[PDB]
Design a protein around this nucleic acid. Sequence first.
RNA 1: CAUGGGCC
RNA 2: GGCCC
Length: 476
Amino acid sequence: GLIVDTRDVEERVHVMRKTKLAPTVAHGVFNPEFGPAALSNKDPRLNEGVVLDEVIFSKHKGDTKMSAEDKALFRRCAADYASRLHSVLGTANAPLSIYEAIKGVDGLDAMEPDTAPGLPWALQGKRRGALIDFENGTVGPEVEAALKLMEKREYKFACQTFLKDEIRPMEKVRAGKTRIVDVLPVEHILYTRMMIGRFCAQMHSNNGPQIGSAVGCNPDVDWQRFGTHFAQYRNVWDVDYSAFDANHCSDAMNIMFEEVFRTEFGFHPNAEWILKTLVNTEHAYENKRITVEGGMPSGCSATSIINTILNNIYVLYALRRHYEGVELDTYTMISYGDDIVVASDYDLDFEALKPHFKSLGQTITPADKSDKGFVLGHSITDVTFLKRHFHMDYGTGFYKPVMASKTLEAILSFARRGTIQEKLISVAGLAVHSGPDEYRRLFEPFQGLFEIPSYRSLYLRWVNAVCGDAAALEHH
RNA sequence: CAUGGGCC
RNA sequence: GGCCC
Ligand SMILES: [Mg+2]
């Protein structure tokens, strides 16, 4: 987005801190090129002479404006896509009762219990439950107050900026390119889950190539459902986006919301409103009060769906912007946020699509750095979706999510205070697809120190997951 | 025990 | 809690 003004206020949101991620016994054995994100602008690991505050807000390269012509084209690609979407899901998007918006419904889980309630609840020393009954299903004073403020759209707000304490590649670590989270006020998140919470639930339960959404899938079983699909087309593309979230032009955002959340589809007149507020946002990074126009507050309710939807419309908008008579069924794709996998028998030319995407402020590049230029012929067994490859299991000829050993070496090398054992269990199910060998090697440094799930146990579990029949039938 | 949403 | 976005 475009930073209109960087003013300095009196208040100051304290975010500075250290990482809770401590090295593990695996570190000294692997020494991965990954490490905790620089949470301090004075961190020695940072290149001598790099303002952490400078990089954090360098993602905003401006809010690309669109010509009425392209706006009409986008509006059509939006209304068109919105047709296929709302067709499958349906038009039962009635406001989710405050109760349902808390406890969650079929598909939509429940609002996190003890998480940053955002502002101004954070400047008054209060927790999430200190304003809402996460045990019951209702809210209190503050909520009901703003709840009535949004009911009349009189409501206004701000976003609290946090430094996502995670593990990242040492290169971007020294580059002070630590990722940040835009924590919005809990009240907002609750209202959004009421306005379109119904919608999201339906999308989650219908993830797939049809609606081009992977939000709600289970890489363990859906990989087999997806793999076959893309391994059916001629060309498979794995596009990448540079600051996908922060580069959503206002015109593309407002048109999308106005097209995908109309009242004719059953949405509440405030569903479109509540979302449009996400355009012009005001961040509160410590003592500074930065204002931005455009982009997406990576950390708001249904933030992934909004991105997934946009990503879907961009592909259609771009293709039509370069070709003629291009319909949805002209190609096939699936995405989870910025991540995306495109496929189409047609020998499309993404390389000549870059500018068309740029007309939206988005910059696409080939996943495979080699010969920076979208080529052709690539199969599903080459692309990487959700940090996972598409490989076949010699044991059952099934498709299974496989993560690069280096990525696994980064995960098993760090962990917070007292979580190793538990983490080993979780991550264990992820390395089961790396094969017996790689598996035993990934947890070798923990033998006798922790309980390591046998490759056997988890393998048989997966088999029953991907296809309950594939397992039982192997008894006859 | 930094967030929205998966998912396990 | 862990991973993914
Ligand atoms: Mg990709």
